Design a protein around this motif. Structure first.
Motif, PDB file in Angstrom:
ATOM      1  N   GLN A  83      -1.079  -7.880  -4.123  1.00 18.18           N
ATOM      2  CA  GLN A  83      -0.282  -8.267  -5.283  1.00 18.18           C
ATOM      3  C   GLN A  83      -1.049  -9.222  -6.187  1.00 18.18           C
ATOM      4  O   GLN A  83      -0.978  -9.110  -7.414  1.00 18.18           O
ATOM      5  CB  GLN A  83       1.033  -8.896  -4.835  1.00 18.18           C
ATOM      6  CG  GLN A  83       2.058  -7.886  -4.395  1.00 18.18           C
ATOM      7  CD  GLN A  83       2.540  -7.032  -5.537  1.00 18.18           C
ATOM      8  OE1 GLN A  83       3.134  -7.530  -6.489  1.00 18.18           O
ATOM      9  NE2 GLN A  83       2.286  -5.733  -5.452  1.00 18.18           N
ATOM     10  N   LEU A  84      -1.777 -10.174  -5.602  1.00 19.67           N
ATOM     11  CA  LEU A  84      -2.561 -11.099  -6.422  1.00 19.67           C
ATOM     12  C   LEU A  84      -3.611 -10.357  -7.245  1.00 19.67           C
ATOM     13  O   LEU A  84      -3.788 -10.634  -8.443  1.00 19.67           O
ATOM     14  CB  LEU A  84      -3.230 -12.151  -5.540  1.00 19.67           C
ATOM     15  CG  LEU A  84      -2.371 -13.298  -5.015  1.00 19.67           C
ATOM     16  CD1 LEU A  84      -3.102 -14.049  -3.927  1.00 19.67           C
ATOM     17  CD2 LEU A  84      -1.989 -14.231  -6.138  1.00 19.67           C
ATOM     18  N   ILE A  85      -4.311  -9.408  -6.622  1.00 19.94           N
ATOM     19  CA  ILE A  85      -5.347  -8.670  -7.351  1.00 19.94           C
ATOM     20  C   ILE A  85      -4.737  -7.871  -8.505  1.00 19.94           C
ATOM     21  O   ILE A  85      -5.237  -7.886  -9.645  1.00 19.94           O
ATOM     22  CB  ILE A  85      -6.136  -7.768  -6.386  1.00 19.94           C
ATOM     23  CG1 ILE A  85      -7.123  -8.603  -5.575  1.00 19.94           C
ATOM     24  CG2 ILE A  85      -6.869  -6.690  -7.144  1.00 19.94           C
ATOM     25  CD1 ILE A  85      -7.578  -7.936  -4.313  1.00 19.94           C
ATOM     26  N   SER A  89       0.601  -8.025   8.464  1.00 25.53           N
ATOM     27  CA  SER A  89       1.197  -6.984   7.635  1.00 25.53           C
ATOM     28  C   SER A  89       1.716  -7.539   6.317  1.00 25.53           C
ATOM     29  O   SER A  89       1.765  -6.817   5.317  1.00 25.53           O
ATOM     30  CB  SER A  89       2.324  -6.298   8.401  1.00 25.53           C
ATOM     31  OG  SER A  89       3.087  -5.474   7.547  1.00 25.53           O
ATOM     32  N   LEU A  90       2.124  -8.807   6.298  1.00 24.78           N
ATOM     33  CA  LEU A  90       2.660  -9.396   5.073  1.00 24.78           C
ATOM     34  C   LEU A  90       1.560 -10.031   4.216  1.00 24.78           C
ATOM     35  O   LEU A  90       1.617  -9.991   2.972  1.00 24.78           O
ATOM     36  CB  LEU A  90       3.735 -10.409   5.457  1.00 24.78           C
ATOM     37  CG  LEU A  90       4.680 -11.018   4.437  1.00 24.78           C
ATOM     38  CD1 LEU A  90       5.480  -9.926   3.781  1.00 24.78           C
ATOM     39  CD2 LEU A  90       5.603 -11.962   5.162  1.00 24.78           C
ATOM     40  N   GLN A  91       0.544 -10.613   4.862  1.00 21.47           N
ATOM     41  CA  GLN A  91      -0.570 -11.198   4.120  1.00 21.47           C
ATOM     42  C   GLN A  91      -1.326 -10.142   3.326  1.00 21.47           C
ATOM     43  O   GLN A  91      -1.779 -10.403   2.202  1.00 21.47           O
ATOM     44  CB  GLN A  91      -1.518 -11.921   5.072  1.00 21.47           C
ATOM     45  CG  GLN A  91      -1.006 -13.261   5.561  1.00 21.47           C
ATOM     46  CD  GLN A  91      -1.952 -13.915   6.545  1.00 21.47           C
ATOM     47  OE1 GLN A  91      -3.110 -13.520   6.661  1.00 21.47           O
ATOM     48  NE2 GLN A  91      -1.465 -14.921   7.257  1.00 21.47           N
ATOM     49  N   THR A  92      -1.496  -8.947   3.899  1.00 22.59           N
ATOM     50  CA  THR A  92      -2.153  -7.881   3.147  1.00 22.59           C
ATOM     51  C   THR A  92      -1.408  -7.581   1.848  1.00 22.59           C
ATOM     52  O   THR A  92      -2.024  -7.414   0.781  1.00 22.59           O
ATOM     53  CB  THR A  92      -2.253  -6.626   4.006  1.00 22.59           C
ATOM     54  OG1 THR A  92      -2.847  -6.958   5.264  1.00 22.59           O
ATOM     55  CG2 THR A  92      -3.099  -5.582   3.318  1.00 22.59           C
ATOM     56  N   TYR A  93      -0.080  -7.528   1.921  1.00 24.20           N
ATOM     57  CA  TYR A  93       0.736  -7.256   0.745  1.00 24.20           C
ATOM     58  C   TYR A  93       0.541  -8.326  -0.320  1.00 24.20           C
ATOM     59  O   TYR A  93       0.346  -8.013  -1.503  1.00 24.20           O
ATOM     60  CB  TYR A  93       2.204  -7.161   1.157  1.00 24.20           C
ATOM     61  CG  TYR A  93       3.184  -7.120   0.012  1.00 24.20           C
ATOM     62  CD1 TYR A  93       3.397  -5.954  -0.696  1.00 24.20           C
ATOM     63  CD2 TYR A  93       3.905  -8.245  -0.350  1.00 24.20           C
ATOM     64  CE1 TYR A  93       4.292  -5.909  -1.736  1.00 24.20           C
ATOM     65  CE2 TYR A  93       4.802  -8.208  -1.389  1.00 24.20           C
ATOM     66  CZ  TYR A  93       4.990  -7.037  -2.078  1.00 24.20           C
ATOM     67  OH  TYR A  93       5.882  -6.995  -3.117  1.00 24.20           O
ATOM     68  N   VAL A  94       0.583  -9.601   0.075  1.00 22.10           N
ATOM     69  CA  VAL A  94       0.473 -10.642  -0.947  1.00 22.10           C
ATOM     70  C   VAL A  94      -0.917 -10.634  -1.586  1.00 22.10           C
ATOM     71  O   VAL A  94      -1.061 -10.879  -2.791  1.00 22.10           O
ATOM     72  CB  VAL A  94       0.842 -12.032  -0.394  1.00 22.10           C
ATOM     73  CG1 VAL A  94       2.269 -12.035   0.114  1.00 22.10           C
ATOM     74  CG2 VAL A  94      -0.117 -12.482   0.674  1.00 22.10           C
ATOM     75  N   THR A  95      -1.961 -10.338  -0.805  1.00 13.59           N
ATOM     76  CA  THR A  95      -3.304 -10.297  -1.379  1.00 13.59           C
ATOM     77  C   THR A  95      -3.434  -9.184  -2.418  1.00 13.59           C
ATOM     78  O   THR A  95      -3.961  -9.396  -3.526  1.00 13.59           O
ATOM     79  CB  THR A  95      -4.343 -10.125  -0.274  1.00 13.59           C
ATOM     80  OG1 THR A  95      -4.295 -11.255   0.602  1.00 13.59           O
ATOM     81  CG2 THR A  95      -5.729 -10.016  -0.864  1.00 13.59           C
ATOM     82  N   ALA A 149      -1.973  -8.468 -10.076  1.00  7.37           N
ATOM     83  CA  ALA A 149      -1.496  -9.386 -11.102  1.00  7.37           C
ATOM     84  C   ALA A 149      -2.629  -9.837 -12.009  1.00  7.37           C
ATOM     85  O   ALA A 149      -2.443  -9.970 -13.222  1.00  7.37           O
ATOM     86  CB  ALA A 149      -0.818 -10.590 -10.454  1.00  7.37           C
ATOM     87  N   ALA A 150      -3.809 -10.094 -11.438  1.00  9.35           N
ATOM     88  CA  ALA A 150      -4.948 -10.454 -12.280  1.00  9.35           C
ATOM     89  C   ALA A 150      -5.303  -9.329 -13.246  1.00  9.35           C
ATOM     90  O   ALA A 150      -5.580  -9.571 -14.433  1.00  9.35           O
ATOM     91  CB  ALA A 150      -6.151 -10.812 -11.412  1.00  9.35           C
ATOM     92  N   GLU A 151      -5.291  -8.088 -12.756  1.00 12.83           N
ATOM     93  CA  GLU A 151      -5.570  -6.952 -13.637  1.00 12.83           C
ATOM     94  C   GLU A 151      -4.555  -6.856 -14.778  1.00 12.83           C
ATOM     95  O   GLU A 151      -4.925  -6.641 -15.945  1.00 12.83           O
ATOM     96  CB  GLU A 151      -5.584  -5.666 -12.818  1.00 12.83           C
ATOM     97  CG  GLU A 151      -5.511  -4.400 -13.624  1.00 12.83           C
ATOM     98  CD  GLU A 151      -5.194  -3.197 -12.759  1.00 12.83           C
ATOM     99  OE1 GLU A 151      -5.693  -3.139 -11.616  1.00 12.83           O
ATOM    100  OE2 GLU A 151      -4.439  -2.316 -13.220  1.00 12.83           O
ATOM    101  N   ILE A 152      -3.269  -7.026 -14.462  1.00 13.18           N
ATOM    102  CA  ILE A 152      -2.235  -6.958 -15.493  1.00 13.18           C
ATOM    103  C   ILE A 152      -2.395  -8.096 -16.496  1.00 13.18           C
ATOM    104  O   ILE A 152      -2.145  -7.922 -17.693  1.00 13.18           O
ATOM    105  CB  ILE A 152      -0.835  -6.961 -14.856  1.00 13.18           C
ATOM    106  CG1 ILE A 152      -0.569  -5.636 -14.148  1.00 13.18           C
ATOM    107  CG2 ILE A 152       0.229  -7.204 -15.899  1.00 13.18           C
ATOM    108  CD1 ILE A 152      -0.316  -4.495 -15.091  1.00 13.18           C
ATOM    109  N   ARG A 153      -2.799  -9.278 -16.029  1.00  9.93           N
ATOM    110  CA  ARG A 153      -3.005 -10.393 -16.948  1.00  9.93           C
ATOM    111  C   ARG A 153      -4.110 -10.086 -17.946  1.00  9.93           C
ATOM    112  O   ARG A 153      -3.983 -10.393 -19.138  1.00  9.93           O
ATOM    113  CB  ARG A 153      -3.329 -11.669 -16.178  1.00  9.93           C
ATOM    114  CG  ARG A 153      -3.874 -12.775 -17.056  1.00  9.93           C
ATOM    115  CD  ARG A 153      -3.776 -14.137 -16.393  1.00  9.93           C
ATOM    116  NE  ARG A 153      -4.186 -14.120 -14.994  1.00  9.93           N
ATOM    117  CZ  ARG A 153      -5.441 -14.042 -14.575  1.00  9.93           C
ATOM    118  NH1 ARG A 153      -6.448 -13.941 -15.426  1.00  9.93           N
ATOM    119  NH2 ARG A 153      -5.692 -14.065 -13.270  1.00  9.93           N
TER     120      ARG A 153
END
Ligand SMILES: *[C@@H]1O[C@H](CO)[C@@H](O[C@@H]2O[C@H](CO)[C@@H](O)[C@H](O)[C@H]2NC(C)=O)[C@H](O)[C@H]1NC(C)=O
Ligand SMILES: *[C@@H]1O[C@H](CO)[C@@H](O[C@@H]2O[C@H](CO)[C@@H](O)[C@H](O)[C@H]2NC(C)=O)[C@H](O)[C@H]1NC(C)=O
Ligand SMILES: *[C@@H]1O[C@H](CO)[C@@H](O[C@@H]2O[C@H](CO)[C@@H](O)[C@H](O)[C@H]2NC(C)=O)[C@H](O)[C@H]1NC(C)=O
Ligand SMILES: *[C@@H]1O[C@H](CO)[C@@H](O)[C@H](O)[C@H]1NC(C)=O
Ligand SMILES: *[C@@H]1O[C@H](CO)[C@@H](O)[C@H](O)[C@H]1NC(C)=O
Ligand SMILES: *[C@@H]1O[C@H](CO)[C@@H](O)[C@H](O)[C@H]1NC(C)=O
Ligand SMILES: *[C@@H]1O[C@H](CO)[C@@H](O)[C@H](O)[C@H]1NC(C)=O
Ligand SMILES: *[C@@H]1O[C@H](CO)[C@@H](O)[C@H](O)[C@H]1NC(C)=O
Ligand SMILES: *[C@@H]1O[C@H](CO)[C@@H](O)[C@H](O)[C@H]1NC(C)=O
Ligand SMILES: *[C@@H]1O[C@H](CO)[C@@H](O)[C@H](O)[C@H]1NC(C)=O
Ligand SMILES: *[C@@H]1O[C@H](CO)[C@@H](O)[C@H](O)[C@H]1NC(C)=O
Ligand SMILES: *[C@@H]1O[C@H](CO)[C@@H](O)[C@H](O)[C@H]1NC(C)=O
Ligand SMILES: *[C@@H]1O[C@H](CO)[C@@H](O)[C@H](O)[C@H]1NC(C)=O
Ligand SMILES: *[C@@H]1O[C@H](CO)[C@@H](O)[C@H](O)[C@H]1NC(C)=O
Ligand SMILES: *[C@@H]1O[C@H](CO)[C@@H](O)[C@H](O)[C@H]1NC(C)=O
Ligand SMILES: *[C@@H]1O[C@H](CO)[C@@H](O)[C@H](O)[C@H]1NC(C)=O
Lengths: 390, 380, 227, 196, 98, 49
Positions: free
Chosen positions: F31-33, F23-29, F35-39
């Protein structure tokens, strides 16, 4: 006499302008400045073997692992796609010229000294003096083209991390383009821009003396060409000094190539965590497959082996996912470098702050481990005086 | 094999990664310590005066060849309930020491001899740690431990200030103080004798009849072994891929001499993988390094399957000028033996190539092999 | 009399019996905290010190003054108790129900069926001179029965307060007494600067292994923010 | 925080969780990398000028009215009238720099989602650049383009009257400068309406 | 379900459920990554249409090779095709310059 | 924990742990995607400025 202090960060220096109804400031001199830009282009190619990583030299674990479908063809496909993309990344940046050009035997370009960037025949690798400091200040963990196997057994001392990774099914592949024909591409690019201008990027290469090309480059930014000819010698000096102090500012600084080392560090750390993850129980009797097999009968060792399998599959999927994300980031950063090479080097750029700071004049490429370095030559105004205008 | 890996009968032009090659073991060796005694189990199971539960009897077993199958004819026990190790796989292990604890209880309390239990026996009489590794054996003994007039020879502790720690004995006859008045040995009102008699009769139904209990505790840890099963020891072979059974530690690999500096209390070695690296020989006391078998990756380079059936094979990152892994009969996993092609072996910075000859001209790259080397299907 | 001294980095033993080389292993176990207070006693009586979570014992004797140690609860003829009295050439470790001595170190044995004999713990050497005041360090603990003893003799010390440096301890014996231990006492004879006592606590350490399998340094993880 | 989220104030669950290796150092590393990247994102957009410029005390630029974009001294935050209508139409759930702890217990009514998140180990960090020195960067950028043209982006800033800069800007798109001077006033009006 | 009683069929059904959930999450994650890549490639095409087609581009090697003159768009299944018309120099002769 | 003895509460606790980690790993993944879009969107704004 030494302590730790806290403060409020300052945004910068303070300045005020003297705007008035009829008053204009005009410069009376100029400066030639050379900056540098570092861009990653590619990352390390890795390959993973499920059978050796998950179920080391065991048949019962392999038979159990066959029951999970195709959860390992998919990881292999993803890693292979990443590797092929890494190979394609360096072809777009460097392979911009169809032919290979060579410098004339006599090197006199009106006063400009290109010694620090042209290839050095005396060195066996035929690399510039500036692209030997870039190759000594970045240390690759594994080049790949080493065929290391044969000495892991005879290490005698504590075996290095590379042997521990190799024995568990994690390997590193060598790039298709050796770092000896990349330098040939850079030499071809750089030897065709100081003997033909920007003409070789559009059609056939047409030769032209260097001072006239410099006059054209000045004319392209709004300064008449007679400024160059009447100040030729001086300008040459300002160029020769500018290069002379770009080597030193790289040779003595602690770490200027911090963008090209983080990639190596991240990949090495990821592989190290993948290796270290093997010694985890995941809620089983033990973390060794040959221990739970020799202490329990076949019917109830399957539960423990299933726990180990379902832990290690997840441990490996996380790695491949993070690799995919990082590869996408590197691909974006390589597309940017390809565009910068097409625009700054094979021509003159009118975009502000793209090809260095100031008014862009020229750019020179150099190759660094897993990346490219741009030397941007720009024109900066100087001593200015007040005047009355109408 | 390429057609088998990707499920089709046709293969397009390119280079494909098929599988790995490994070198198979040729021999098996077994190494156990040098001991011949037969340590007694017949003096524990076969007795007459099994101790009370509150003062249980402990015996330590030492240098001997234990055989956990001749004790099935010492007691009518139906089966051993074991926790750390399966009872079947007990003749193939070596333990540092074995402890046998004997006592007698009631039937319905037999379920209390297990990790993480609670009661009047697992609190004040006999406690087992939560990480127990061993076996228990309980069997009915109504014929012996019973009398028509009662058997007032077994006692059990009833009152105690605090719960026992695991494997702790508490023989003491004090006077319990349950109340306010600090009695000084009167054992009158609100002061009881901690030990209670435990009388037995043949008329009582099952669950109220005596049960004789013996528990065996092992030490499955890393130390010199003392008690071992009855398996013979073969000779020792070095510089050759084999299967080894070093003192209950099984594996495969190549065993060679060592320069390491094991201290007298050291017995194993480990790198940062939680896997064994060096072993001390039980009968020689010399250090040996263990190295995995030779392995590598195999790739197949082919033109289109509609052009020709010829292929070339690339062995990834090996020195086949010195390591050609040529075998006979059954000694290697990919069994096709493509070798012996004459002057058609090449050594590339990315490994070595079999089945393609190196020309000294230059062409555009068709199939990328690596390190600046390409391959293609050409005319003669 | 008695006083307090600092222990510095002292009292680190080998957690297990596995060879390791060039690693940074971290272990959570009973250890003596870094920079703690150790009670330094004098002799010229012999208080019954409390025992809890194990005890670190250090002594700097010329040849020999300390025979052994006594363990148990109430130290009388109503509960079982240990005896680790040493000898010229042997050790008489035993578990029994000794009655008293108040000065053989016992009078009578009531219900006693445990004994053990092995090589002596104390080993001393001199380079033809008594200035080689070897410092003996011991660690005792009682985790789940199984009395653990660790020891190390360091003869390179000269001795003013406590040595500064780092050293390791090797195991001696593991043996199942299976009793309740709360109190502690020392046995020492007469004659014609030593005897330091400290207590262990459950802590996490990070140990650094040499290239030869020895322990060179260690860092505590509950001492400073930096640690 | 893994320990608070997964195994709330329990020791047995923590001891079991220690058996899964480093599945929580990795998540912490990923989140920290994301946070540092977020901090670096706003430095590249705004920190384009080395110095801080200021507008002259007298504001007459040939007729052009920059009142709606220049900073307002009367407001305590020193923000433009246009930069306020944008700070009021976006409502952040958690600013981060609030130190909220101390009132979740005294909410009395149904506790808000923020307290429920906080009690379970999920927290929000504040940005390094406050939204009061970002406005200073914007003021410096905007005050150096109406008093010096584009010269301050290349070398030293050189002042120039605004109508002449506008004439240069027209000349850059293919219309001669005499078009501006003969239609200056009108053009100014078309600008003032456009902002209005 | 037809070979075991309800109490001990739940373990097997739980195994199937926990396998298939992961099998589906992998698919959605890979789809997200591919979608991001396609979005980048579509932004590039939008920029190219705005610059090459609705105007003349002075950027080198952006709107084809040579000196850019014109561009024409065409539509293909799930994509776009640009026809770039450029001007290339030809037969050259030596001269003396001052 | 208060209804089962330690030996067989470990199975239930393991189920909870292995659910919550995912449940927590899904959230971090995700978030990474994001963050790349925002960058990417921030790089565009830097160029535009
Ligand atoms: C423009 O700047 C250059 C460099 O600062 C000036 O050249 C210097 O001139 C002084 C005096 O003639 C010499 O001492 C320096 O050695 C010169 N520098 C170099 C690098 O040659 C130049 O004079 C300036 N132009 C004007 C008009 O002042
Ligand atoms: C071009 O630059 C090179 C490099 O700075 C010059 O070579 C140096 O010249 C100085 C002065 O004679 C020597 O002290 C250095 O040892 C030389 N270095 C090398 C690497 O040769 C060179 O003189 C310059 N001018 C040319 C080549 O015409
Ligand atoms: C510049 O624009 C401002 C804002 O529109 C003008 O100020 C307004 O002027 C009108 C007419 O007098 C008033 O009704 C408004 O109340 C004013 N608003 C504010 C916020 O001051 C200003 O007059 C214009 N001209 C200048 C400043 O010279
Ligand atoms: C510029 O001219 C305007 C209009 O006459 C005047 O208001 C202003 O004060 C002048 N600037 C200066 C610095 O005098
Ligand atoms: C591979 O073989 C060559 C030729 O004998 C030898 O020079 C080289 O050292 C070998 N490499 C390894 C890693 O054994
Ligand atoms: C131009 O004049 C202003 C006002 O007198 C003064 O502040 C400024 O320094 C002058 N410029 C130079 C280059 O001296
Ligand atoms: C012990 O063994 C002897 C000899 O086999 C036998 O006579 C005796 O009955 C046994 N004792 C018990 C308690 O079974
Ligand atoms: C040991 O004795 C002390 C003192 O009576 C007591 O507090 C402690 O609980 C005892 N230990 C055990 C395991 O009973
Ligand atoms: C094993 O023990 C026997 C009997 O003492 C002895 O003869 C033999 O040499 C020993 N072998 C080894 C390898 O110690
Ligand atoms: C052919 O290649 C070999 C390989 O090294 C080389 O030695 C030889 O000189 C080459 N000959 C010709 C004619 O190219
Ligand atoms: C040792 O005890 C003394 C009190 O006698 C105290 O002042 C000192 O701080 C203690 N040492 C340490 C390291 O805490
Ligand atoms: C000490 O050892 C000697 C010889 O080893 C022995 O005769 C003597 O009885 C021992 N004394 C004690 C108290 O252990
Ligand atoms: C200890 O020995 C005495 C002496 O006969 C005896 O009365 C008592 O019952 C014994 N106690 C135990 C627990 O063996
Ligand atoms: C390990 O022992 C060797 C002796 O063979 C010695 O030379 C070396 O210095 C030792 N290592 C260290 C780190 O002292
Ligand atoms: C924090 O402390 C200050 C000073 O007393 C107080 O004004 C403020 O309300 C406090 N904040 C909270 C959330 O308690
Ligand atoms: C120009 O002259 C050079 C040197 O004579 C010659 O190599 C070149 O081919 C000439 N160019 C043309 C177009 O003939």
């Amino acid at each position: 006499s030494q302590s730790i202090i806290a403060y409020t960060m300052s945004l910068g220096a303070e300045n005020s302008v003297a705007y008035s109804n009829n008053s204009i400031a005009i410069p009376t001199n100029f400066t030639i400045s050379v900056t540098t830009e570092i861009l990653p282009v590619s990352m390390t190619k890795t390959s993973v073997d499920c059978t050796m990583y998950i179920c080391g030299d065991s048949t019962e674990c392999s038979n159990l692992l066959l029951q999970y479908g195709s959860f390992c063809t998919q990881l292999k496909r993803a890693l292979t796609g990443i590797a092929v993309e890494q190979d394609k990344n360096t072809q777009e940046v460097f392979a911009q010229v169809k032919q290979i050009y060579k410098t004339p035997p006599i090197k006199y370009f009106g006063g400009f000294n290109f010694s620090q960037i042209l290839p050095d025949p005396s060195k066996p690798s035929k690399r510039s003096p500036i692209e030997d400091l870039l190759f000594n200040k970045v240390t690759l963990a594994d080049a790949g083209f080493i065929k290391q196997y044969g000495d892991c057994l005879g290490d005698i001392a504590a075996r290095d991390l590379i042997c521990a990774q190799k024995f568990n099914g994690l390997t590193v592949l060598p790039p298709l383009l050796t770092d000896e024909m990349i330098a040939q591409y850079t030499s071809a690019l750089l030897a065709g821009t100081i003997t033909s201008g920007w003409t070789f990027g559009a059609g056939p290469a047409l030769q032209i003396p260097f001072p006239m090309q410099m006059a054209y480059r000045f004319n392209g930014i709004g300064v008449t060409q007679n400024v160059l000819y009447e100040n030729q010698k001086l300008i040459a000096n300002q160029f020769n000094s500018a290069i002379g102090k770009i080597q030193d500012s790289l040779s003595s600084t602690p770490s200027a190539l911090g963008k090209l080392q983080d990639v190596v560090n991240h990949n090495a750390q990821a592989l190290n965590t993948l290796v270290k993850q093997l010694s985890s129980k995941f809620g089983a009797i033990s973390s060794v497959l040959n221990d739970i097999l020799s202490r329990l009968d076949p019917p109830e060792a399957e539960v423990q082996i299933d726990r180990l399998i379902t832990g290690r599959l997840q441990s490996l999927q996380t790695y491949v996912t993070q690799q995919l994300i990082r590869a996408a980031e590197i691909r974006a950063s390589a597309n940017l470098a390809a565009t910068k090479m097409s625009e700054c080097v094979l021509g003159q750029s009118k975009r502000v702050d793209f090809c260095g700071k100031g008014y862009h004049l020229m750019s020179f490429p150099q190759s660094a481990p897993h990346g490219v370095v741009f030397l941007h030559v720009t024109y900066v105004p100087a001593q200015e005086k007040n005047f009355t205008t109408a | 094999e390429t057609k088998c890996t990707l499920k089709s009968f046709t293969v397009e032009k390119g280079i494909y990664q098929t599988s790995n090659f490994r070198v198979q073991p040729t021999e098996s060796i077994v190494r156990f310590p040098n001991i011949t005694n037969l340590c007694p189990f017949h003096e524990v199971f076969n007795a007459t005066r099994f101790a009370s539960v509150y003062a249980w009897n402990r015996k330590r077993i030492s240098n001997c060849v234990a055989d956990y199958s001749v004790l099935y004819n010492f007691a009518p026990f139906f089966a051993f309930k074991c926790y750390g190790v399966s009872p079947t796989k007990l003749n193939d292990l070596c333990f540092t020491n074995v402890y046998a604890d004997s006592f007698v209880i009631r039937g319905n309390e037999v379920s209390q001899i297990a990790p993480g239990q609670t009661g009047n026996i697992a609190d004040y009489n006999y406690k087992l740690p939560d990480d127990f590794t061993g076996c228990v054996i309980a069997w009915n003994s109504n014929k012996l431990d019973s009398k028509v007039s009662g058997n007032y020879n077994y006692l059990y502790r009833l009152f105690r200030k605090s719960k026992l720690k695991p494997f702790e004995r508490d023989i003491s006859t004090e006077i319990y103080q349950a109340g306010n008045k600090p009695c000084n040995g009167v054992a009158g009102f609100n002061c009881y004798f901690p030990l209670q008699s435990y009388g037995f009769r043949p008329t009582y139904g099952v669950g109220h009849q005596p049960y004789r209990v013996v528990v065996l505790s092992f030490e499955l840890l890393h130390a010199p072994a003392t008690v071992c099963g009855p398996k013979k020891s073969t000779n020792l072979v070095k510089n050759k891929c084999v299967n080894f059974n070093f003192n209950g530690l099984t594996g495969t690999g190549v065993l060679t001499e060592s320069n390491k500096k094991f201290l007298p209390f050291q017995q194993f070695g480990r790198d940062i993988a939680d896997t064994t690296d060096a072993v001390r020989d039980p009968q020689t006391l010399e250090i040996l390094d263990i190295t995995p078998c030779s392995f590598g990756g195999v790739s197949v380079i082919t033109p289109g399957t509609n052009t020709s059936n010829q292929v070339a094979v690339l062995y990834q990152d090996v020195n086949c000028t010195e390591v050609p892994v040529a075998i006979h009969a059954d000694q290697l996993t990919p069994t096709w033996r493509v070798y012996s092609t004459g002057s058609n072996v090449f050594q590339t910075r990315a490994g070595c190539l079999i089945g393609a000859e190196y020309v000294n001209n230059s062409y555009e790259c068709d199939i990328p092999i690596g390190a600046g080397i390409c391959a293609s299907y050409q005319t003669q | 009399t008695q006083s307090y001294t600092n222990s510095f980095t002292r009292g680190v033993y080998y957690p297990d019996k596995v060879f390791r080389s060039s690693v940074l292993h971290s272990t959570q176990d009973l250890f003596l905290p870094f920079f703690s207070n150790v009670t330094w006693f004098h002799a010229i009586d012999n208080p019954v010190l409390p025992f809890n979570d194990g005890v670190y014992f250090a002594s700097t004797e010329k040849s020999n003054g300390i025979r052994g140690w006594i363990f148990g609860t109430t130290l009388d003829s109503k509960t079982q108790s240990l005896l680790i009295v040493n000898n010229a050439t042997n050790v008489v470790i035993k578990v029994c129900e000794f009655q008293f001595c108040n000065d053989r170190v016992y009078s009578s044995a009531n219900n006693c069926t445990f004994e053990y004999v092995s090589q002596p713990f104390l080993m001393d050497l001199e380079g033809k001179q008594g200035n080689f005041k070897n410092l003996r360090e011991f660690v005792f603990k009682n985790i789940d029965g199984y009395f653990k003893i660790y020891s190390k003799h360091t003869p390179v010390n000269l001795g003013r307060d406590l040595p500064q440096g780092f050293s390791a301890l090797e195991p001696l014996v593991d043996l199942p007494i299976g009793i309740n231990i709360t109190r502690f006492q020392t046995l020492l004879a007469l004659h014609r600067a030593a005897y330091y006592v400290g207590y262990l606590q459950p802590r996490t350490f990070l140990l650094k292994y040499n290239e030869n399998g020895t322990i060179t340094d260690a860092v505590d993880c509950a001492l400073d923010p930096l640690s």
